[PDB]
Design a protein around this ligand. Structure first.
Ligand SMILES: NC(=O)c1ccc[n+]([C@@H]2O[C@H](COP(=O)([O-])OP(=O)(O)OC[C@H]3O[C@@H](n4cnc5c(N)ncnc54)[C@H](O)[C@@H]3O)[C@@H](O)[C@H]2O)c1
Ligand SMILES: [Mg+2]
Length: 355
């Protein structure tokens, strides 16, 4: 059974179809408003899934062109954004064409940003093929690319006409990438839904095992949470940063490609929970519970040794404009706060570094 989540962001509205072995010819027909579709993918995802979408849209009568990018966060820059513009103009595509992002969050951001710039804005469709992009990139409307001096500093707000989330595509995902997605799923439960946490504890073995039905429920519940947070924020969104201030310092010190972002978020959530226990807000049992579910998702709960001077420098260089952290008053009840002892924060960092 396929599930549909209806998102309302900005003055725009779109469905997210979630299931397994979906038919893109059936699902996308109402959402391809013109004759032409540009499928953007990369050298890893395209040989696996491109023909599936190209053959479906061509059977629909559409003109399909493609732009296949190298695989990597390091290519998420304006030089490779330009390759999409090259492909779009080489194909002669017009104002009513659709750009279809086939891939993970890197492709989603690049194709989304390209779709906002081409002819000052064309249509955008998301087909996320990583778990993380399915539960994170599919709501929010942010698109972007990197600059040598700053990540995700160039981009556009661009909402899709539709998001198609097919769990079967997760079967070819590397194990670390799957776990990296589950880190974000766990995050939603820890910041705002203890019932969701209970469900993850009961079902984690099957999610790691890539049970199609359980994955689909986790994706639906994750997207529903983020859609609710951003919609309420428009009516805070900062709670989505649980674990990210700690995690950013981990990533920055370990360097490009050492840890996945979701792996850093996992350990950052442990540090956040640990600090929360030291502030007296949650119990040691709550921290143990948080470590256990993250570990069962095959995620790290401790990172290598990082000098505190460097760690704190990275947390202070990511400052919004006073340092505010996303911590836990209870499991499933995150808060953004300035009221923490910095000495206790250093203790929580050091406690979750392994030898
Ligand atoms: N716009 C947003 O709100 C938002 C949200 C989250 C992340 N992002 C961006 O997303 C990017 C990270 O996304 P990601 O974690 O999906 O990384 P990614 O897009 O680099 O994908 C991870 C790896 O898996 C490969 N891959 C993807 N799908 C596959 C599949 N089905 N089978 C086998 N291999 C597959 C990709 O080629 C890549 O090597 C970052 O640039 C981040 O800034 C944006
Ligand atoms: Mg994240």
């Amino acid at each position: 059974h396929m599930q549909t989540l209806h998102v309302e962001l900005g003055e725009r509205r779109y469905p997210i179809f979630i299931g397994s072995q979906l038919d893109p010819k059936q699902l996308l027909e109402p959402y391809i408003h013109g004759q032409q579709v540009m499928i953007v993918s990369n050298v890893t995802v395209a040989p696996l899934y491109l023909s599936h979408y190209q053959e479906a849209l061509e059977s629909l009568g559409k003109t399909v062109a493609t732009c296949i990018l190298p695989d990597g966060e390091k290519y998420k820059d304006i030089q490779h954004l330009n390759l999409i513009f090259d492909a779009l103009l080489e194909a002669g595509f017009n104002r009513d064409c659709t750009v279809l992002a086939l891939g993970g969050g890197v492709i989603g951001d690049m194709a989304g940003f390209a779709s906002a710039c081409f002819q000052r804005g064309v249509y955008f469709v998301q087909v996320p093929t990583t778990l993380l992009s399915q539960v994170d990139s599919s709501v929010g409307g942010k698109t972007g690319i990197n600059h040598p001096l700053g990540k995700n500093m160039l981009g556009a707000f661009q909402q899709p006409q539709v998001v198609l989330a097919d769990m079967a595509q997760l079967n070819t995902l590397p194990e670390r990438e799957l776990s990296a997605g589950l880190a974000e799923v766990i995050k939603y439960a820890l910041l705002g839904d203890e019932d969701f946490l209970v469900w993850l504890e009961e079902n984690m073995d099957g999610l790691v095992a890539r049970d199609a039905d359980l994955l689909a429920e986790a994706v639906y519940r994750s997207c529903a949470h983020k859609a609710r947070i951003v919609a309420n924020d428009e009516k805070e969104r900062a709670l989505l940063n649980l674990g990210h201030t700690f995690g950013h310092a981990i990533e920055s010190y370990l360097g490009y490609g050492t840890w996945l972002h979701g792996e850093a978020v996992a350990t950052g959530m442990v540090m956040a929970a640990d600090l929360s226990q030291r502030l007296g807000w949650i119990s040691n049992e709550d921290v143990a519970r948080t470590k256990k579910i993250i570990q069962r998702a095959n995620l790290p709960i401790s990172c290598p040794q990082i000098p505190l001077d460097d760690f704190l420098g990275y947390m202070a260089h990511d400052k919004k404009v006073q340092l505010r952290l996303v911590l836990l008053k209870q499991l499933g009840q995150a808060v953004i706060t300035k009221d923490f002892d910095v000495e206790l924060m250093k203790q929580a960092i050091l406690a979750n570094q392994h030898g």
